[model samples]
Target: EASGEIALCKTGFPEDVYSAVLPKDVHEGQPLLNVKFSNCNRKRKVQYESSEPADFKVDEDGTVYAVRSFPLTAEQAKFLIYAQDKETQEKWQVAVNLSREPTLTEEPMKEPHEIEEIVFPRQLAKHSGALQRQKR
Candidate 1:
């Protein structure tokens, strides 16, 4: 006779988090990215934040769009995106960050090296063609 140990395991995909660092300049109605979901959460509910005047929108199939021209200041660029499970009422977060655009600088032109000028010797045509030449 022999003794055996029994093991148990959960049968489902693990929850994943989404995040991004984007430029601070985006027009209203700009499409950011589609919010992907777990196979079990395809039809789950979605939310932008806990307050009013949500700055983003996630459509029925997870298409994301901006609700307004977000404030250009760094302090106003940070936000969260949340998705909830319809069946279990669970929620997950997506972190977002925005940075200011960099200012451009003009590149200076380079100067060419200098070289000495060249000189040539002058020539003289002697004997002005003295008239007719005899025989030869």
Candidate 2:
């Protein structure tokens, strides 16, 4: 059985979910989570933060192959996910941007307006996706 603050299970998880909450510390080779999507109908397991190669390659047999010179950040390691459609049995690609925290502005500013606030752009005729987000 896995011990410590982190845990690893031999089996995989279901789709359309992020980890219940983010991990506090990532194990060297263990992936942080598993996810599934409605559109693709595939379960994509995730592992972020690799101290190995950055450039990865995929093969006709669906085996992952790669080449790298340096390790990748937790956010950088999120692109690896494997899932299949239940109905179609077709292969598809899933892209995930793992960085949820807001990044500092390129140039530090003293005033609030100087920074571009992250928000959904308002449109006259369309519903905005910004409704559910917390105010800054």
Candidate 3:
């Protein structure tokens, strides 16, 4: 009886249907997850759908691939996975969190060049006065 309880938590589905392990974190434009369903029907084909299809896809072999069709913000986002049991007509939806792959970090600006004081000739005013008188 206790063993059954552990199996229930792990599978979360009837023994006849397929069970999956959804990824918690995902990357953009890359294969975020590769789900392997257990107890799947060999004759019947399994199907998959997503509430956020723009972000993900499930392959024939149960690989949960990611797509970067749309832009994602810096903040984390959530998506839903729908796995349909063709033989049993049962479905399960699970939420998965997504994050952009290591967003570029901004580096601090380099230190500025050293400053120098400007010095002007003190005789400039007297020189200008003499020049002006000679010209007049």
Candidate 4:
């Protein structure tokens, strides 16, 4: 996530004086969603099946905010992202916006075909290692 300076104001300063602006440090791993990090580098990007790519902005407390251009898919487990430091050129990454896949619990599948075949990724496991290997 990219870190930058934000304008902080004083409580009793009438909300107009005392422009306290400081460059706060931010990190990507604070949220720790279902993201896959290559290393402690911020030079990274986010990807999903039906979701558009998302970017990250870190706060002083390492809170990662996903700046996504599009809405995330209902079946998406988590969003991944990477951020790079422009001055030092170092990178750190983490996941944010963790969520469960959309489940159909109201009614069971009537047809056997719908139950047998997996059309979406919501029914699949969250971990990558335990996933069943199949041709896409």
Give the alpha-carbon lDDT of every model: 0.43, 0.36, 0.46, 0.33
- For model 2 the local lDDT of residue 67 reads 41
Off-target runs (Cα >4 Å) in candidate 3 are 1-28, 40-42, 69-71, 100-136
Clash pairs, model 2 backbone: 15-36, 16-36, 31-47, 53-68
Q: TM-scores across all candidates?
A: 0.41, 0.25, 0.45, 0.23
**By TM-score, who's the top model here?**
3
Q: On residues 11-56, what C-alpha lDDT tens digit does candidate 1 reach at each position?
A: 2223433332234465555335444544453444544342213366
lDDT of 1 at 118: 16
Candidate 1 regions with alpha-carbon error over 4 angstroms: 1-26, 41-54, 73-76, 100-136
Order the numbered candidates by lDDT, best leading. 3, 1, 2, 4
lDDT per residue as tens, model 4, 2-115: 887775632111211111111112222222122222323343233222122444454423333444433333333344344444544445444343333244554546632221
lDDT of 3 at 114: 11
Model 3, residue 39: displacement in angstroms? Answer: 2.2
* Candidate order, TM-score descending: 3, 1, 2, 4
lDDT of 2 at 42: 46
Q: Which ten residues in a row have the lowest lDDT in candidate 1?
A: 111-120
